[PDB]
Coordinates of C-alpha atoms and ligand atoms in Angstrom, one line a residue:
Chain A
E1 CA -127.7 -26.4 -76.2
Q2 CA -130.4 -27.1 -78.8
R3 CA -129.0 -29.7 -81.2
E4 CA -131.6 -29.7 -84.1
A5 CA -133.4 -27.1 -86.2
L6 CA -136.7 -28.0 -87.9
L7 CA -137.5 -25.8 -90.9
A8 CA -140.5 -25.3 -93.2
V9 CA -139.1 -23.7 -96.5
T10 CA -141.0 -22.5 -99.6
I11 CA -139.1 -23.0 -102.9
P12 CA -140.4 -22.5 -106.4
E13 CA -142.2 -25.5 -108.0
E14 CA -140.0 -25.8 -111.1
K15 CA -137.3 -28.1 -112.4
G16 CA -133.8 -27.6 -110.9
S17 CA -135.3 -25.8 -107.8
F18 CA -134.4 -28.4 -105.3
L19 CA -130.8 -28.5 -106.5
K20 CA -130.5 -24.7 -106.2
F21 CA -131.9 -24.8 -102.7
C22 CA -129.6 -27.6 -101.6
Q23 CA -126.6 -25.7 -103.0
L24 CA -127.5 -22.8 -100.8
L25 CA -127.6 -25.2 -97.8
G26 CA -124.2 -26.7 -98.8
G27 CA -122.2 -25.8 -95.7
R28 CA -124.9 -27.2 -93.2
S29 CA -125.4 -30.6 -91.7
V30 CA -128.9 -31.4 -93.0
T31 CA -130.2 -34.7 -91.6
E32 CA -133.7 -34.8 -93.2
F33 CA -135.5 -33.5 -96.3
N34 CA -139.1 -34.3 -97.1
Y35 CA -141.2 -33.1 -100.0
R36 CA -144.2 -34.2 -102.1
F37 CA -145.7 -32.4 -105.1
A38 CA -148.7 -30.3 -103.8
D39 CA -149.2 -26.7 -105.0
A40 CA -148.4 -26.0 -108.7
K41 CA -146.4 -22.9 -108.1
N42 CA -144.7 -23.2 -104.7
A43 CA -143.2 -26.3 -103.2
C44 CA -143.0 -26.9 -99.4
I45 CA -139.8 -28.5 -98.0
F46 CA -139.4 -30.0 -94.5
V47 CA -135.7 -29.7 -93.4
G48 CA -134.1 -31.2 -90.3
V49 CA -130.6 -29.8 -89.5
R50 CA -128.1 -31.1 -87.0
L51 CA -126.6 -28.1 -85.0
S52 CA -123.2 -27.8 -83.3
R53 CA -123.5 -24.1 -82.3
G54 CA -127.1 -24.1 -81.1
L55 CA -129.2 -21.0 -81.5
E56 CA -126.4 -19.1 -83.1
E57 CA -126.3 -21.6 -86.0
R58 CA -130.1 -21.8 -86.2
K59 CA -130.3 -18.0 -86.6
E60 CA -127.4 -18.1 -89.2
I61 CA -129.3 -20.6 -91.3
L62 CA -132.6 -18.7 -91.1
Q63 CA -130.9 -15.5 -92.1
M64 CA -129.0 -17.2 -94.9
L65 CA -132.3 -18.6 -96.4
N66 CA -134.0 -15.2 -96.2
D67 CA -131.0 -13.4 -97.7
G68 CA -131.0 -16.0 -100.5
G69 CA -134.6 -15.3 -101.4
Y70 CA -136.4 -18.2 -99.7
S71 CA -139.3 -18.0 -97.3
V72 CA -138.8 -20.0 -94.1
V73 CA -140.9 -20.8 -91.0
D74 CA -138.9 -21.9 -88.0
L75 CA -140.4 -25.0 -86.5
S76 CA -137.5 -25.7 -84.2
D77 CA -139.5 -24.9 -81.0
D78 CA -142.9 -26.1 -82.4
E79 CA -144.1 -28.9 -80.1
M80 CA -146.5 -30.2 -82.8
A81 CA -143.6 -30.4 -85.3
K82 CA -141.4 -32.2 -82.7
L83 CA -144.1 -34.7 -81.6
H84 CA -146.2 -35.2 -84.6
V85 CA -145.8 -33.3 -87.9
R86 CA -142.2 -34.4 -88.5
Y87 CA -143.6 -37.9 -89.0
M88 CA -146.5 -36.8 -91.3
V89 CA -145.1 -34.6 -94.0
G90 CA -145.3 -35.7 -97.6
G91 CA -148.1 -38.2 -98.3
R92 CA -149.9 -38.4 -101.6
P93 CA -149.4 -35.9 -104.5
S94 CA -152.1 -33.3 -105.1
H95 CA -153.3 -35.1 -108.2
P96 CA -152.3 -38.4 -109.9
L97 CA -148.8 -38.3 -111.5
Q98 CA -146.9 -40.5 -113.9
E99 CA -143.7 -41.0 -111.9
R100 CA -140.9 -43.5 -111.4
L101 CA -139.6 -44.0 -107.9
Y102 CA -136.0 -44.9 -107.0
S103 CA -134.1 -45.5 -103.8
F104 CA -130.4 -44.7 -103.4
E105 CA -127.7 -44.8 -100.7
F106 CA -124.2 -43.5 -100.2
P107 CA -121.5 -43.3 -97.5
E108 CA -121.7 -39.9 -95.7
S109 CA -118.9 -37.4 -96.2
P110 CA -118.9 -33.6 -96.4
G111 CA -121.0 -32.7 -99.5
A112 CA -122.0 -36.3 -100.2
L113 CA -125.7 -35.6 -100.8
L114 CA -125.0 -32.5 -103.0
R115 CA -122.5 -34.5 -105.1
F116 CA -125.3 -37.1 -105.5
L117 CA -127.9 -34.5 -106.4
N118 CA -125.6 -33.0 -109.1
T119 CA -125.5 -36.4 -110.8
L120 CA -129.3 -36.7 -111.3
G121 CA -129.8 -34.0 -113.9
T122 CA -132.3 -31.2 -113.7
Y123 CA -133.9 -32.4 -116.9
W124 CA -136.2 -34.5 -114.6
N125 CA -138.9 -32.9 -112.4
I126 CA -138.8 -34.4 -108.9
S127 CA -142.3 -35.1 -107.5
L128 CA -141.3 -36.8 -104.2
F129 CA -138.1 -36.5 -102.2
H130 CA -137.0 -37.9 -98.9
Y131 CA -133.5 -37.9 -97.4
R132 CA -132.5 -39.1 -94.0
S133 CA -129.0 -39.4 -92.5
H134 CA -128.9 -39.4 -88.7
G135 CA -125.3 -40.4 -87.7
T136 CA -125.7 -43.5 -89.8
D137 CA -122.5 -44.2 -91.9
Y138 CA -124.9 -44.0 -95.0
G139 CA -127.3 -41.4 -96.3
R140 CA -130.6 -42.7 -97.7
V141 CA -132.6 -41.1 -100.5
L142 CA -136.0 -42.0 -101.9
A143 CA -137.1 -39.8 -104.9
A144 CA -139.8 -39.9 -107.6
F145 CA -139.1 -38.4 -111.1
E146 CA -142.0 -37.4 -113.3
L147 CA -142.4 -38.9 -116.7
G148 CA -142.4 -36.7 -119.8
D149 CA -142.1 -37.8 -123.4
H150 CA -140.0 -40.7 -122.1
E151 CA -139.3 -42.3 -118.8
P152 CA -136.2 -42.1 -116.6
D153 CA -133.8 -45.0 -116.6
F154 CA -131.3 -44.3 -113.9
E155 CA -130.2 -47.7 -112.5
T156 CA -127.1 -48.6 -114.6
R157 CA -125.6 -45.1 -114.6
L158 CA -126.2 -44.5 -110.9
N159 CA -125.1 -47.9 -109.9
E160 CA -121.9 -47.3 -111.8
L161 CA -121.3 -44.2 -109.7
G162 CA -121.8 -46.1 -106.4
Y163 CA -125.2 -45.0 -105.4
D164 CA -127.0 -48.4 -104.9
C165 CA -130.0 -47.4 -107.0
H166 CA -133.2 -49.5 -107.0
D167 CA -136.5 -49.0 -108.8
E168 CA -139.1 -48.7 -106.0
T169 CA -142.1 -47.9 -108.2
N170 CA -143.8 -51.1 -107.1
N171 CA -142.7 -51.0 -103.5
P172 CA -145.7 -52.0 -101.3
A173 CA -145.3 -49.2 -98.8
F174 CA -145.1 -46.6 -101.4
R175 CA -148.0 -48.1 -103.3
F176 CA -150.2 -48.3 -100.3
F177 CA -149.6 -44.9 -98.7
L178 CA -147.9 -42.4 -101.0
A179 CA -149.2 -43.1 -104.6
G180 CA -151.6 -40.8 -106.2
Chain B
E1 CA -135.6 -61.2 -82.2
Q2 CA -137.5 -58.7 -84.3
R3 CA -138.9 -56.1 -82.0
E4 CA -141.3 -54.1 -84.2
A5 CA -144.1 -54.8 -86.7
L6 CA -145.1 -52.2 -89.3
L7 CA -148.6 -52.7 -90.8
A8 CA -150.6 -51.1 -93.6
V9 CA -154.3 -51.7 -92.7
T10 CA -157.5 -50.9 -94.7
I11 CA -160.5 -49.9 -92.5
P12 CA -163.9 -48.5 -93.7
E13 CA -164.0 -44.8 -94.2
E14 CA -167.0 -44.1 -91.8
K15 CA -167.6 -42.7 -88.4
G16 CA -166.7 -45.0 -85.6
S17 CA -164.4 -47.1 -87.7
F18 CA -161.2 -46.2 -86.1
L19 CA -162.6 -46.9 -82.6
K20 CA -163.7 -50.4 -83.8
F21 CA -160.3 -51.1 -85.3
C22 CA -158.5 -50.0 -82.1
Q23 CA -160.8 -52.2 -80.0
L24 CA -159.7 -55.2 -82.0
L25 CA -156.1 -54.3 -81.4
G26 CA -156.7 -53.8 -77.7
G27 CA -154.3 -56.4 -76.3
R28 CA -151.4 -55.3 -78.4
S29 CA -148.6 -52.7 -77.7
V30 CA -149.3 -50.2 -80.5
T31 CA -146.6 -47.5 -80.6
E32 CA -147.7 -45.6 -83.7
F33 CA -150.9 -44.9 -85.7
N34 CA -151.0 -42.5 -88.6
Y35 CA -154.0 -41.7 -90.9
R36 CA -155.2 -38.9 -93.1
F37 CA -158.5 -38.8 -95.1
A38 CA -157.8 -39.9 -98.7
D39 CA -160.2 -42.4 -100.4
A40 CA -163.9 -41.8 -99.7
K41 CA -164.7 -45.5 -99.1
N42 CA -161.6 -47.1 -97.6
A43 CA -159.2 -45.5 -95.1
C44 CA -155.5 -46.5 -94.9
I45 CA -153.9 -46.8 -91.4
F46 CA -150.2 -47.0 -90.7
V47 CA -149.6 -49.0 -87.5
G48 CA -146.3 -49.6 -85.6
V49 CA -146.4 -52.3 -83.0
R50 CA -143.8 -53.1 -80.2
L51 CA -143.3 -56.9 -80.1
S52 CA -142.1 -59.0 -77.2
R53 CA -142.5 -62.4 -78.9
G54 CA -141.0 -61.6 -82.3
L55 CA -142.4 -63.2 -85.4
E56 CA -144.8 -65.4 -83.4
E57 CA -146.5 -62.2 -82.2
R58 CA -146.3 -60.5 -85.6
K59 CA -148.1 -63.5 -87.2
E60 CA -150.7 -63.6 -84.4
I61 CA -151.6 -59.9 -85.1
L62 CA -151.8 -60.4 -88.9
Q63 CA -154.0 -63.4 -88.4
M64 CA -156.2 -61.6 -85.9
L65 CA -156.7 -58.7 -88.3
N66 CA -157.7 -60.9 -91.2
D67 CA -160.0 -63.0 -89.0
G68 CA -161.6 -59.8 -87.8
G69 CA -162.4 -58.7 -91.3
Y70 CA -159.6 -56.3 -92.0
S71 CA -157.1 -56.3 -94.9
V72 CA -153.5 -55.9 -93.9
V73 CA -150.2 -55.6 -95.8
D74 CA -147.2 -56.6 -93.6
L75 CA -144.5 -53.9 -94.0
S76 CA -142.3 -55.2 -91.1
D77 CA -139.5 -56.4 -93.4
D78 CA -140.0 -53.7 -96.1
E79 CA -136.8 -51.6 -96.3
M80 CA -138.6 -48.6 -97.9
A81 CA -141.1 -48.6 -95.0
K82 CA -138.3 -48.8 -92.4
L83 CA -136.0 -46.2 -94.0
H84 CA -138.5 -43.8 -95.7
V85 CA -142.2 -44.3 -95.8
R86 CA -142.7 -44.5 -92.0
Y87 CA -141.8 -40.8 -92.0
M88 CA -144.0 -39.8 -94.9
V89 CA -147.5 -41.2 -94.2
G90 CA -150.4 -38.8 -93.9
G91 CA -149.8 -35.5 -95.5
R92 CA -152.7 -33.4 -96.9
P93 CA -156.3 -34.6 -97.2
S94 CA -157.5 -35.6 -100.7
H95 CA -159.7 -32.5 -100.9
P96 CA -160.1 -29.4 -98.6
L97 CA -161.9 -30.2 -95.3
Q98 CA -163.6 -28.1 -92.6
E99 CA -161.8 -29.6 -89.6
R100 CA -160.7 -28.7 -86.1
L101 CA -157.3 -30.0 -84.9
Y102 CA -156.6 -31.0 -81.3
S103 CA -153.6 -32.3 -79.4
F104 CA -153.8 -34.6 -76.4
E105 CA -151.5 -36.4 -74.0
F106 CA -151.9 -39.0 -71.3
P107 CA -149.7 -41.2 -69.0
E108 CA -149.3 -44.6 -70.5
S109 CA -150.8 -47.6 -68.9
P110 CA -152.5 -50.8 -70.3
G111 CA -155.4 -49.6 -72.4
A112 CA -154.7 -45.9 -71.9
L113 CA -155.2 -45.0 -75.6
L114 CA -158.4 -47.0 -75.9
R115 CA -159.8 -45.4 -72.8
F116 CA -159.0 -42.0 -74.3
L117 CA -160.6 -42.9 -77.7
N118 CA -163.8 -44.0 -76.0
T119 CA -164.2 -40.5 -74.5
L120 CA -164.2 -38.8 -77.9
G121 CA -167.5 -39.9 -79.2
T122 CA -168.2 -41.4 -82.6
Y123 CA -170.5 -38.6 -83.4
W124 CA -167.4 -36.8 -84.9
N125 CA -165.7 -38.0 -88.1
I126 CA -161.9 -38.2 -87.7
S127 CA -160.0 -36.8 -90.7
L128 CA -156.4 -36.9 -89.3
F129 CA -155.0 -39.1 -86.6
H130 CA -151.5 -39.5 -85.3
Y131 CA -150.4 -41.4 -82.2
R132 CA -146.9 -42.0 -80.9
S133 CA -145.8 -43.6 -77.7
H134 CA -142.3 -45.1 -77.8
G135 CA -141.3 -45.9 -74.2
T136 CA -142.1 -42.3 -73.2
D137 CA -144.1 -42.1 -70.0
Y138 CA -146.8 -40.3 -72.0
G139 CA -148.7 -41.1 -75.1
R140 CA -149.3 -38.3 -77.6
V141 CA -152.2 -37.8 -79.9
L142 CA -152.9 -35.3 -82.7
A143 CA -156.4 -35.6 -84.3
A144 CA -158.6 -33.6 -86.6
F145 CA -162.4 -33.7 -86.4
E146 CA -164.6 -32.8 -89.3
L147 CA -167.2 -30.0 -88.9
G148 CA -170.9 -30.8 -89.5
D149 CA -173.8 -28.5 -88.6
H150 CA -171.7 -27.3 -85.7
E151 CA -168.1 -27.5 -84.6
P152 CA -166.5 -29.7 -82.0
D153 CA -165.6 -28.0 -78.6
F154 CA -163.6 -30.6 -76.7
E155 CA -161.2 -28.6 -74.5
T156 CA -163.1 -28.2 -71.3
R157 CA -164.4 -31.7 -71.1
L158 CA -161.2 -33.4 -72.2
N159 CA -159.1 -31.3 -69.8
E160 CA -161.4 -32.3 -67.0
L161 CA -160.7 -35.9 -67.8
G162 CA -156.9 -35.3 -67.7
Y163 CA -156.0 -35.4 -71.4
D164 CA -154.2 -32.1 -71.7
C165 CA -156.3 -31.0 -74.8
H166 CA -155.1 -28.0 -76.9
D167 CA -156.6 -26.6 -80.1
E168 CA -153.9 -26.9 -82.8
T169 CA -156.0 -25.7 -85.7
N170 CA -153.7 -22.7 -86.2
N171 CA -150.5 -24.6 -85.4
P172 CA -147.8 -23.4 -87.9
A173 CA -146.5 -26.9 -88.7
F174 CA -150.0 -28.3 -89.4
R175 CA -150.9 -25.2 -91.5
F176 CA -147.8 -25.3 -93.6
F177 CA -147.6 -29.0 -94.3
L178 CA -150.9 -30.9 -93.6
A179 CA -153.8 -28.6 -94.3
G180 CA -155.9 -29.0 -97.3
Ligands
LIG1 C1 -138.3 -30.6 -104.4 C2 -138.5 -30.7 -105.9 C3 -138.6 -29.3 -106.5 C4 -139.8 -28.6 -105.9 C5 -138.8 -29.5 -108.0 N1 -139.9 -30.3 -108.4 C6 -137.5 -30.0 -108.6 O1 -137.5 -30.9 -109.4 O2 -136.4 -29.5 -108.3
LIG2 C1 -159.2 -43.2 -88.8 C2 -160.5 -42.5 -88.9 C3 -161.6 -43.4 -89.6 C4 -161.2 -43.8 -91.0 C5 -162.9 -42.7 -89.5 N1 -162.9 -41.4 -90.3 C6 -163.4 -42.5 -88.1 O1 -163.8 -41.3 -87.7 O2 -163.4 -43.4 -87.3

């Protein structure tokens, strides 16, 4: 019956961590991810999952995450998550960051988001990540990459690969609400 | 044609400010508000508005806010606001707060949210506010109130008035994602 799981997952706050977490979720129909840098050691990920086998599948995913070494809080029956908090996760980082923001899109197919994430390169730390794909023929990603000794320059390479990459660092909605 | 405005408004970060701002918006069909304490002097409000007269009404609201002394950035045509940022506003406060969180609900009628806000009392500073009402027979509010010399105690009074008030301070979704 229930068609959506809402999950609060802790993953380590380190480069490559999100990719490893998404690899464990590979067989599942994730429809939302949301993250912003907050705690220096442990990152918090909001996950929305489309279910086809209801509570059986919800329990499988919870068990898989625990067996894989991730902590998860199940928010699937949490009225505040359903009515409010699923629209409020993320916000501003815990301190000001030097970061470059990009948007991307791709047609949905099995594994499409994971193939996209593998192209980014774990050299870059991710300081903001939002994905949404609800039945829409295209998945949508907004992600910020933290500057190190140099800045990321993704547009040409990612456009070549079909991912419709745009620099959003000066986007007014980002600047007004999410910047540090 | 266009049926929704998305607005980024600056209001002063002081007690009673949100009520004054909502009073100016009184004749409009607001469907979303989202705010979290961030800057000490100027608060940022995300507003979603249902339109029945399209761009004419969008322009009326923008002009009304400027004429009333509020700064507004129009995000109604901003693709990042539409696809991403409208799900990411709010987050954690800029520093840790002593605050009590409550949820409320009421049947929608003209002016219902404003009648509700007048009952709260501008004695309390609001440090988190989320409202959503999209065609649903009931409007939904989640709000945090900052502690001073004593703590707020709203349940009995607000339940008497019909507002279905619950203390959400220990809600798992709030604790995991939005707490300071
Ligand atoms: C979600 C991002 C995670 C926490 C990490 N910053 C990464 O780059 O993989
Ligand atoms: C949105 C809340 C505003 C900024 C103020 N803190 C108030 O209590 O009215």
